[PDB]
């Protein structure tokens, strides 16, 4: 089977989420064929060169699972879009761009964090366009680490989750040639049927781990998303 998770927002001061995640790795990810993490895995990320003990311990826990043979794919979210190849190398995972189309038991399936669909938040979209400009990424990777912390504090202060724009879903799905989309970000776990030019399709939204854990599990026969307690 394959597992999909997102929006864990891992951080040292949330040891309940961490414990839930490491137990999920031991009891479920180890036995799966693949694990996909669709963004906002960490609550924030200043860059791989800023990793602390907590973040390194998470990489080491992923690496145990990858060494066991489970394929781990990590996609950026908006909170942790600076995660780099050095982190992924420690963790044994593959960085997946947003968007990516994967083959899922023979079906092409679109994966995204989801915030790119939330086009009605105009302010959010302006910030996102600045943050992902290649020139901004160039300058950020040339900023000293202490200055990146100063910027992160500034952005945190100068700033509830606006949901996806309905018409964007069929537009992007048709553009990638898929009838199944999986994303996170909106904190509204659900499966949405829809139409694409008269044809049925489906959008699956992953749950966030603030109050309970979540996982979507898929195999050739079916799929299910269900929560589980943090404690
Ligand atoms: Mn997000």
Author numbering: 2 to 160, 170 to 241
The authors write:
In the fourth step in this pathway, UDP-2,3-diacylglucosamine is hydrolyzed to 2,3-diacylglucosamine-1-phosphate (also called lipid X) and UMP. This step is catalyzed by the specific pyrophosphatase LpxH in 70% of gram-negative bacteria, including E. coli and Pseudomonas aeruginosa, and by LpxI in the remaining 30%345. LpxH shares sequence similarity with metallophosphoesterases and requires Mn2+ ions for phosphatase activity. PaLpxH consists of two domains: a catalytic domain homologous to metallophosphoesterases (MPEs) and a helical insertion domain (HI domain) inserted in the middle of the catalytic domain.
To investigate enzymatic reaction mechanism, a mutant was prepared in which Mn1-coordinated His10 was replaced with Asn (H10N). Its structure was determined with (Mn2 bound form) and without (Mn2 unbound form) manganese ion. As expected, the H10N mutant did not bind to Mn1. Although it was prepared using the same protocol as the wild type, this PaLpxH mutant did not capture a product molecule (lipid X). The substrate molecule UDP-2,3-diacylglucosamine was also not observed in the electron density map. However, except for the loss of Mn1, no large conformational change occurred in the vicinity of the mutated Asn10 residue, and the structure of the whole catalytic domain was similar to that of the wild type. There is no electron density for the C-terminal half of α6 and the following loop region (residues 161–169 in P212121 crystal with one Mn2+, 159–165 in P212121 crystal with no Mn2+) in the apo form, indicating they are highly mobile and disordered. In the apo form, α7 (residues 169–172) disappears and a loop (P212121 with one Mn2+) or a short 310 helix at residues 168–170 (P212121 with no Mn2+) is created. A significant structural change in residues 158–172 is important for the recognition of lipid X (and probably also the substrate); the binding site is wide open in the apo form, whereas in the EP complex, two alpha helices (α6 and α7) are formed to assemble a stable EP complex.
